Amino acid sequence: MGRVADTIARGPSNSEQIPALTAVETGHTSQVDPSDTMQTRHVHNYHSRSESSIENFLCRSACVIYIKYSSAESNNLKRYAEWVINTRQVAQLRRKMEMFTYIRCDMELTFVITSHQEMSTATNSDVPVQTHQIMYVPPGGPVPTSVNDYVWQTSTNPSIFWTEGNAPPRMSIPFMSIGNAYTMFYDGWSNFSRDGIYGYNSLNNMGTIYARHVNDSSPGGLTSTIRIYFKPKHVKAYVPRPPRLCQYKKAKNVNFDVEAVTTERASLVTT
Amino acid sequence: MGRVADTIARGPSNSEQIPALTAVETGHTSQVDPSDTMQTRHVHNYHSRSESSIENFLCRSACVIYIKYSSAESNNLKRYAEWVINTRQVAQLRRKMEMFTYIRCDMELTFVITSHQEMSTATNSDVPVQTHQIMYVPPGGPVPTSVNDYVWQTSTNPSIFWTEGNAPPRMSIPFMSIGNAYTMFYDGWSNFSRDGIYGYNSLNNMGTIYARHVNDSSPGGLTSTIRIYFKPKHVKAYVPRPPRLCQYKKAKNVNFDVEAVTTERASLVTT
Amino acid sequence: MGRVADTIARGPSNSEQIPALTAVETGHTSQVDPSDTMQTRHVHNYHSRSESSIENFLCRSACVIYIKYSSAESNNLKRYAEWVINTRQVAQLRRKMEMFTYIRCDMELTFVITSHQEMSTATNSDVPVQTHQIMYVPPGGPVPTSVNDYVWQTSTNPSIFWTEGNAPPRMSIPFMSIGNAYTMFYDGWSNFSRDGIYGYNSLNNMGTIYARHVNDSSPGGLTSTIRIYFKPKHVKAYVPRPPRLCQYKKAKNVNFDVEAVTTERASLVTT
Amino acid sequence: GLPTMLTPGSTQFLTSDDFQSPSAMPQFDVTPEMNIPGQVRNLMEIAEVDSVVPINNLQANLKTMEAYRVQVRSTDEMGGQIFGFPLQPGASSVLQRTLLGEILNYYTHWSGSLKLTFVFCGSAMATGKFLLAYSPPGAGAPDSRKNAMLGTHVIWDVGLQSSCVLCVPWISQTHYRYVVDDKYTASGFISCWYQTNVIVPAEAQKSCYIMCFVSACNDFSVRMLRDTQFIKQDTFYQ
Amino acid sequence: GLPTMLTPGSTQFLTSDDFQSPSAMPQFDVTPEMNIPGQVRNLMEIAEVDSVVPINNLQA
Amino acid sequence: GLPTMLTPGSTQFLTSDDFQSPSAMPQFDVTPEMNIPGQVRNLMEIAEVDSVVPINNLQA
Amino acid sequence: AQVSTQKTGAHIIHYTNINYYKDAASNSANRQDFTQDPSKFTEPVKDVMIKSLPALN
Amino acid sequence: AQVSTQKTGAHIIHYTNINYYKDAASNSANRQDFTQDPSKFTEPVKDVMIKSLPALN
Amino acid sequence: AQVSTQKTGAHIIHYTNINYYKDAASNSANRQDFTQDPSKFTEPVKDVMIKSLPALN
Amino acid sequence: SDRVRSITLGNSTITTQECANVVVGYGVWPDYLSDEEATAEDQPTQPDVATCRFYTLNSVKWEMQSAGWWWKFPDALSEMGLFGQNMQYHYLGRSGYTIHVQCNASKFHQGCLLVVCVPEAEMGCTNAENAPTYGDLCGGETAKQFEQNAVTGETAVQTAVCNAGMGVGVGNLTIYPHQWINLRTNNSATIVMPYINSVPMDNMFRHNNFTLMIIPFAPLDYVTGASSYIPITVTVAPMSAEYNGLRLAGHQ
């Protein structure tokens, strides 16, 4: 297992060994212990670095979008979802994955689907329990264009059917990428002319998740909302990066606005 | 297991062996590797042909019909379903099985049954949860003619009772056919005079699936709909066929309308 | 196992051993048996001290607060809970833990969440089943300020989602403290100047539990209430204390009002 | 079937769980691994790396490069205190936006020694000594060099070696200190003073610069995740 | 009984699953197999066969 | 799956039960124990200790 | 699986327990530990006092 | 119980399957059979054609 | 079944895990791997620097 | 001493007499692609000593108001030597590097630089609706330079050091392989980068493996009458270059 290094005792010294002096004119950072600048005592130290792994750091579920869709078209919600998969909508899950240049992992998608009735003029409203379909179209497939069409037959597309009141539905998505790891920062362009889309959005192409109410519309109608949650598993993350300092602007770019390094102080010397 | 062939290195050659020349005046297609037209290098190749089996190709569930029936007769829906089993209603599941001449398989029928309330003048409407019956009448049995009659006693007929809100009900249907495989194309006629029905519809005779609301009608009434899903299992498919080029016309015939081989190009030479 | 001491027979005695006399001028309490002041008989005694352990005493669940929150703001209930964790709200669970100076234990938090509809002018009210979120913010995290904001994304915070009608949700909280035991009485002050907060409330800093309705508000609105229940486990309690004699006043102090030692009697001699 | 019952919490979704769940593409052949350099396996392989510390964060230096360097200079008296800030990484303004402050602000506990490595960016004919110091809490910051040397301290002498490491020790009455500022578990003060003076020849500059780096030692650990509060949004980015 | 709980996704119908499900005709005697020529076991036994390519697809 | 049924009392919360329940912080490193004097293991280690009795409890 | 004796009452009697979780704080509570040591609240004295002898010689 | 290898990906890995029903048509689908034989749609010729030789002598 | 040690806290403690699925991407996440190698972000230098010696000779 | 090094690659050599070690980025020394991590099924040309050898990029003046510089690779070697003639005839390529920044100064000068190789440095843009045009990322052999204060253009790269043109704290560029050229110790920095990408080889023109950045962290300062021009010269030598998938000239 993993545990912190023990502190080891030393007496006073008065030798020609200098641990304290170093030159940080090299990438080599100092390796000094607190057993090299003062005497210390033997402390058998039982602390574990067990929550600072990259499979405890990244391995908690986090929301990545919500899509709303309606059974009567409440106010520009259509009757089906649609959402081109990326991790860039949020600033939570996104930030932790932009702290590494490359990550390979196996997600678990968990959906949390809830509904609420609309304002409507319908009276004597009783609806049976809703069933929702969540279909995943890998890129280049056919895309639905209406609530009912042939695309929702799910002839080979992965699809989840779920009825309200049951536990949130989840599934695992294996590591699926052209690369040998997902790329979180791409410095290239789509074209060889250095034209078109620039950045990580060039490589992003993970398909689209649609969803709809299976049930034919009731008179009152409802508005459902689906919240997608990704939880990495089996994570190997290569090449670390300084975490973001700036608020994001866009989900396809890194554009940023210039921001302060740190919060103010009164002066150099502050208690 | 199954894995792709490795590429094997070769140096330049200048011999009297011609792998490249062949005669396609025979059914024998060329067996040339890319190691026979240029030098290549040794590539140990780990790709698997594991999703291109016929028990991964055909072994995903696909819709094959929906039947609607009502608890008050909404608009010519009767009070029970009826549907003579075939795989020819759709163009999804149908196409993949008309890519083989003969298939033997054990289905899993999964039903997804949903309901919605009708437009009605009934007020103070509260309905208990519905129970639906799905009865399978093998061919030559007695057929129901009303919502309540003696045929729905299911004295020996397979039948599923299911109450809304529970998981979709499923069952397995073993390989049941007169033949030693299902026949997807029959070139014969029903009669020996070459008269009557022609094509695969002659051999088709798989019984009929009926369904109804078990519950006696409530004042508001409902319209339920049942979607049948077939998933092959244990599939052995014999004799392959070119997949369809043309849109289907009918579910008992192959009649087709003459259609283009391929989409246009501007010219012979296009970038 | 644990069992009571047996009573052992003795005959009459007339010796220079005095078990009965003692001096309680020492902390040493008398160890006399009833076999030292009268003859007794041998009684093999099978009673067990098995319900007077500290893991049977403290190991039953007990309510520690209820918080109310609303889906429409009934009457100053906001739309989310909030409650800074402590065990001092009640007088039940509190008293049993103020009978020991230090306790280390692993809780089980069980929530019992119920709802009732508000008085409202809404008509034709039908609500889908509610889903409630209970988020735990360890101290120093970001705190929600509205029903919907970024804090409820639960990017790393523990959180429970639960839908009404299911069994009460529970979880275990390991022993989490800076100390090597929880402190139930602190005689110090927060500052080194002996200023600021005094008492056990100085050390208390266990984070905050928020909760809300996941569902967007319906027209009628509801008022939900959550009751938190703590059950110790794996309890080691050090240093006992006399139990409280006085009613509590405050949940951050021990302030008390002077109260009678015992209930009245008529006289010294009462039958 | 097997007669079973459902214990409390059983249709819940807990974000910190790990359970098995059926694959959404059965028999999927994942792309082979390759050795991409620099695999991270723990975040004490990022928090043990030096990071420049903005010890001159005033209010006009925050969007310039002046943040990261504090001017030390020849004086005609003795010179006072170059800088000083309360230690408490991930809640001190100075230390919370470095790599031992944006990797501690995903945690709410931290422990173990850290170390500050100073570097002198003066000329090669400039020389001087400085008394680096750390004073455990319970007296406030030292207000003179006399009180500053009662704490743990390291006299740095600028020579060919350009850097000297004040390795703060642990010293705490708890095994972990909160990441957030809490008066209970204050973490002491860092201060730096002129031991001597910067003495430099006529034809070289009288102003030099000291920069500070911060990294954790090999006894450092953290516990218990929380989301960072340095990032925020109002709505989804699109 | 045995105390068990239901993990997320448990009344779902996933089209790509394979689970066991009770037969709808118990003890059914399936028709014997015979060797019908040309069994396909993989679709790289159809995709490795020559097919004429319409390389003069214009518009007429 | 395994065919099981739910016996009476199975969504109940009983306060005197003990069942296992999933941790809310996985892999949490609890603080080490130390020997704090005077561990109580039973409440007949408090009820076997002398306590002054108010045998002159009148009303004043 | 750990097989342990039940609480039996005085004049089979086994139960099986399997731990399913990866934390030891998720285990069901101990209730089978009946260990005691009264003599440190009850007899905290430095020098042993024998019952049959007078306390103060 | 039958214990079989999972689909593993390239550079534990077992799963247990128990059949609960009395029909063999109730068993979960095969997906671990990757057997092939291309040479009967690909090389159906009566007399073997060697690649390196001309097809028509 | 694989039997593995739980996360234990410092001064039984086993758990049993059985994998039920045919894909290895359906297995529960690793959290028991605590392996490290700091010295390649921390000491990336070509020639070893000994702590007790001056860095620049 | 330990202040002296010599590096010989090809027919070039570069020597130093004030040096602080060599930083091997991520502790992996560049080497040819293995046959277990290959993916391209044709013989790779490996020119060896015709492409692995020090190339010198244009020198930049270090002023006392300079805010830094950056060169994206391998777009700064697109015109250099026979390295640049094997990116135009191949669809793929991979190659480590051994960037050597050098910048001598007297013992009466003072100043400090941070030489850092940032894999996958994706630059911002002044307008948040646009992504920067090609000419504003790359200058070829000529460095594009940071500005002290925030700039406003349209398709211009957002250049402010304090964000490093990436929106990350500039002091936190240190997990990336780096050395410091401080003018009272060393006067050279050597960073041997391996090939870092998520695919085994990738098209040289389209994609930029890493971006060198040189950022003054203490301004150049000197007493007047001393030298007023001190240049910073960056040489870089490909290591273990191999290219594959030959095709016609160009990059259209």
Author numbering:
A (entry chain A), B (entry chain A), C (entry chain A): 2 to 272
D (entry chain C): 1 to 238
E (entry chain C), F (entry chain C): 1 to 60
G (entry chain D), H (entry chain D), I (entry chain D): 2 to 12, 23 to 68
J (entry chain B): 10 to 261
Tell me, in the authors' exact words, what the paper reports:
Recently, we discovered a second druggable pocket at a conserved VP1–VP3 interprotomer interface in the viral capsid.
The control structure of CVB4 incubated without compound revealed no additional density inside the pocket. We did not detect a conformational change induced by the presence of CP48 (RMSD for native versus CP48-bound virus: 0.45 Å). First, in CP48–CVB4, density corresponding to the native pocket factor within the β-barrel of VP1 appears to be altered by the presence of drug; however, there were no major conformational changes in the four capsid proteins based on comparison to the control structure of CVB4 alone. We were unable to perform similar experiments with CVB4 here because there is no infectious clone available.
